[PDB]
Symmetry: D2
C-alpha cells in the first residue's frame, strides 16, 4: 500500500546497486486495479513527467514524487501548493520542486522537468497552472487504465469492458455473473463508453461521500436510489449528465438484488475510496 | 449511532402512545461526546429550531430532520439544497421543508418554522441563506458543548477544560495524565480558550483529511509535524491563526511520546471523523 | 455625489457646531434613488448610541455598504491590519476613529472571521433593500404592484417622460391575473444588477447567433446569474419601461448603459 | 472600435470578393494597443485550415477572447444549448456557421467540459499576451527592460507627452542593478488589470484611514488580488508613468480611470 512497498515490488532493474523502474514497471506500479507483455507502443506522458533526470528509468525519488503529486485530491491542491511554495511568493519554481526530489531520493534505502519549468528552467507555476498540471497528470493515468480495455484506440470501450473496470474498483463471481448480460460489441443498438464518460465516472468516485449523503437524504423521504436519482446526483456532482449506458452498467453490475434501488451495501461500501477521502 | 437508536434511547416521555423528547433529552441526544440535572437556564436556539410545531417537545420526525440538517458537511450544502429544492426554482419554501418533516414523521414507529419562513410562512431560502441557517445551527450546538465547560458564561474555558473537550473527541488515562500539566485557572500567565477558537478547532477537525495530507507532505521532506507546522496548516485550513494555548494544549494532550512531532498515530487516527468525512 | 456632500445636505441637527442625522435624515440619505420602528441599518451606524448619526458614523456605514459581495475578502484583508485572519474591534473602528477624530461582544472581546464579516455585510445590504422596498409597501403586504416596481426601476436609472409614459400600461393593482412582485424577487433583481457585466457578455454571445435579446434570453440569463427562477412580471416590467424603441430587443443602451463594478 | 470595423481595416487579402487576414494581419488585429513561427492563436482561429482568417473566424476568435475568466461559466451555459454539461462541436461552431453563412478530436467526437473550456480559454489568453510581450522581446530573453514595460503600459492607456517624458527616467538596459520584467510578471500584471474594480475599492478603504495610495499600498493590494509577490520594478514603472502629478499618491485618475468589466 505504501509507495515504497509498491516500488520495491516493481523496481525490476539495478544500476550501481540502486533499484530502478523501467517504463513497463512504472505503468504496472501506477495501475493497481489492473496489476497486483504490455506491448507499449508510445511512451506515456506520465512516464516523461515522472522521469525528471531523463535517463529513461524511474528512481525511487522520482516514484515517490510522482505518487505524491498524483495522490493529491483536486480540492486540496491549494493546501499542497502552499506547503511546497517554500518562500511564500505564490509561485513554484524549479528549485522548490527539485528541492523535494533531492530529499525524497536521499531518503532512498540505497542512499529539473523541462516539461514544467521550460528548456532553461526559468519559468514558474502559479496555483492555477499547478492545478492544471495536476489535472493533466490525473487524466493521463486514467488514459492508461482506459487503454488496457481499448488497445485499438477507438476512443471507447464496450459495456462489458466498462463492467470489468467497475469491478476492478471494487473490494466477485456474483458481480462477474452480470457481465454476461452486458454487451461486448459496439454496434447501433449497443453503444460504448467514451473516455470522457470514464473520466466523469472517476469524478463521481472522488466525491463518493456526496453520493453517500444523497442516498441518506432520499432514504429519509423514502425515495429509493433508482437510476433517476443516480442520474440527477451525478449531474450535480460531475456537472455532466451521465449517458444511460454508464448508468445501465452501474445498476446491472452492482444492483445485486435487481430491485432497482442502489443501496449503500451495494455500491458506496464496495468502492475503495481514495487516500484522503 | 443511527438517529433512531439515539431517539429511542433519549425520548423519555410519551403522549398518546407516541414517544417524545423534552428539552433536556434533546440536549443530551445531540451532545454525544458529553452524554452517552443539566440545570438549563434558557431554551437553546437549537431546540426552538428543532421544535417545528411548538408544543415544546421534539417528535421523532423533528429529531430526524434536525439530525439530518446538522449532519450536512459545509461543503456539501449545495448538493443537499438541490435535493430538497423539489421544484428546481432555486429556493426552499415552507412546503418543501414541511413536506420532508411530514414523511419523516409518518415513518415513525408509532405511525412551518416561523423562524425560517416568517410569521406568515411566505418567505423562502436561497442557497446562501440556507448555508447561513445551517451555519448558525452548527455554531449553536458548538455553543451547547462549550457551555458545559463554561457554566458562568465568561466567554472562555481553561486549558484543562479544553483538554477534557479534546479527549471527548477521541477514541484515556495516558491522555488524562497530561491534563495534570494543564492550567485550570484563567490568570495572567495562563490564558483561556475563547468560543471563537473552539469553533475554529472544530473547523480543523472538519478538514482532518487535509491535516492528513499535510503530515504526509512534510514526512516526505523529512520535516516533523511540530507546533510550527501545526500552526501554519491551521492557518491555511481555518483561515485563522491558532493562538498558542490551543496548540500547546493539543500537543500536551496528544503528543504522547513528548518528542515534539505530532504523528498520525497520535492525533489524526485518534479523532472520530464526521459522518461523511 | 460623494458621501461627504450627501452627509452635509441631509444632516438636519446642528449641535456644538457639527451636523448630525436623525433616523429620518439617515433613511433619506442611504436611499439616494428615492430622495415606524428603528432600522437595523441605523442601529449599526450609531456606534456611540447617541441616537443620531455623526459624519464619521455615516462615512463608515457608507464604506461598508459600498463593498461588493464578491470583493469582501479583499476588504477583509485590508482591515485585518495584523494578518491573523480575524478583524478585532480595534481594527474595525479604525476608520471611525480617524474620520471622527478630524458583533465584538459587550466586552469587545469577539473577533470577526471572514465568514462572519460576509454575513454581517449581507444583513446590512438586505436591510437597506428592505427600506427601499418598504417605501412602496407601507401596508407591509410583502409584495408591490408592477407600477411600483416600474417606479423603483426608473429610480435606479440614469425621468425621460417616455420612462413615465410606460407606467400607465403597468397594473397598479395586485389581483389573480396581475401578480405582485415580492421582496425576495426585488432582492434577486438586485443581484442581477450587481452582475450587469455578465448580462452584457450574454448579449454579445446571443447576437453572435443572430439571436436578439428578448424576454426569452433575459429569463435564461437571469436564471444562470441569480440561480433562481425570474418572475415573468419582473421581466415584463423591465421590457415595458426600458425597451424604449419597443422592438422587443433590449439593447446595451436602453438597459445596461442606463443603470466599483 | 468594433471587431467588424477592425476586421475590415486589417484584412489585406481580397479573393472572391471577400476579405481575409494573413498571419501578420491577424497578429496586428488582435494586438490593438500596439497597432517567425505561426502562433497557437492563429491556428485556433483558422478552423478551416486554409491558412487565412475569414471574417467569421475572426469574430469567433474575438468573442472567445473577450470572455472574462470569471464569467466563463456563464458563457459555457449559453453555449451548451442542450443543457447536458458539455459543449459539443456542433454547439461550439454555432456562431461560426451563422457569422460565416451570412479540441473535439479528429472525429469531432470529443465533448468539452467547463474545466476543459476554462483551460482552452486560458491558453488562448496567454498566447495573445505572449505575442504582445514578444513584440518587445525579439531576442527571446524572456524579460523586457523597464522602459519597454513603460511603453506597453502607455499602450494600455486611454500619448500625453508627459507619458512620453517619463520614459527617459526609466532604464532601457537590464543589468545587476536594473532588473528586467519577466513574462510571468507581465501576465500577473494583466490579472491586476482584470480586477481594477478591486484596486478602486482598496483605494477608498485606504483613504478612510487617512492613508494615501503609495507604492506600499499598491504592493499589498496587488499581492492579495494576484496572490503573487509584485515585482518592485513593475510598481516603480507604474508610478513613474502614471503618477502624473508626482505626489506619490496614485489617484483614481492617473491609473484606474486611465486604463465587459
Ligand atoms: Ca530517471
Ligand atoms: Ca515560491
Ligand atoms: Ca438494489
Ligand atoms: Ca414539537
Ligand atoms: Ca423550490
Ligand atoms: Ca510525537
Ligand atoms: Ca451617533
Ligand atoms: Ca486582526
Ligand atoms: Ca430595444
Ligand atoms: Ca480560414
Ligand atoms: Ca451540449
Ligand atoms: Ca498622483
Amino acid at each position: 500500500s505504501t509507495p515504497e512497498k509498491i516500488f520495491q515490488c516493481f523496481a525490476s532493474v539495478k544500476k550501481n546497486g540502486e533499484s530502478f523502474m523501467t517504463v513497463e514497471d512504472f505503468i504496472r506500479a501506477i495501475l493497481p486495479h489492473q496489476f497486483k507483455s504490455l506491448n507499449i507502443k508510445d511512451i506515456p506522458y506520465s512516464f516523461k513527467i515522472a522521469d525528471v533526470d531523463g535517463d529513461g528509468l524511474i528512481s525511487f525519488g522520482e516514484f515517490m514524487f510522482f505518487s505524491t503529486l498524483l495522490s493529491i485530491p483536486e480540492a486540496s491542491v491549494p493546501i499542497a501548493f502552499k506547503i511546497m511554495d517554500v518562500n511564500g511568493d505564490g509561485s513554484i519554481d524549479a528549485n522548490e520542486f527539485n528541492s523535494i526530489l533531492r530529499i525524497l531520493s536521499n531518503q532512498s534505502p540505497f542512499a529539473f522537468n523541462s516539461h514544467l519549468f521550460g528548456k532553461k528552467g526559468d519559468k514558474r507555476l502559479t496555483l492555477d497552472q499547478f492545478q492544471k498540471f495536476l489535472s493533466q497528470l490525473r487524466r493521463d493515468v486514467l488514459q492508461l487504465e482506459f487503454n488496457f480495455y481499448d488497445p485499438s484506440g477507438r476512443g471507447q470501450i464496450s459495456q462489458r469492458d466498462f463492467g470489468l473496470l467497475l469491478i476492478s474498483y471494487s473490494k466477485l463471481e456474483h458481480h462477474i455473473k452480470a457481465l454476461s448480460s452486458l454487451p461486448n460489441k459496439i454496434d447501433a443498438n449497443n453503444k460504448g463508453i467514451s473516455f470522457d464518460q470514464f473520466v466523469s465516472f472517476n469524478t463521481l468516485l472522488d466525491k463518493l461521500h456526496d453520493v453517500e449523503l444523497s442516498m441518506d437524504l432520499y432514504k429519509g423521504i423514502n425515495q429509493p436510489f433508482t437510476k433517476s436519482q443516480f442520474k440527477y446526483v451525478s449531474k450535480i456532482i460531475c456537472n455532466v449528465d451521465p449517458q444511460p449506458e454508464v448508468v445501465n452498467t452501474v445498476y446491472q453490475v452492482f444492483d445485486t438484488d435487481k430491485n432497482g434501488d442502489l443501496a449503500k451495501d451495494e455500491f458506496v461500501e464496495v468502492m475503495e475510496r481514495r487516500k484522503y477521502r
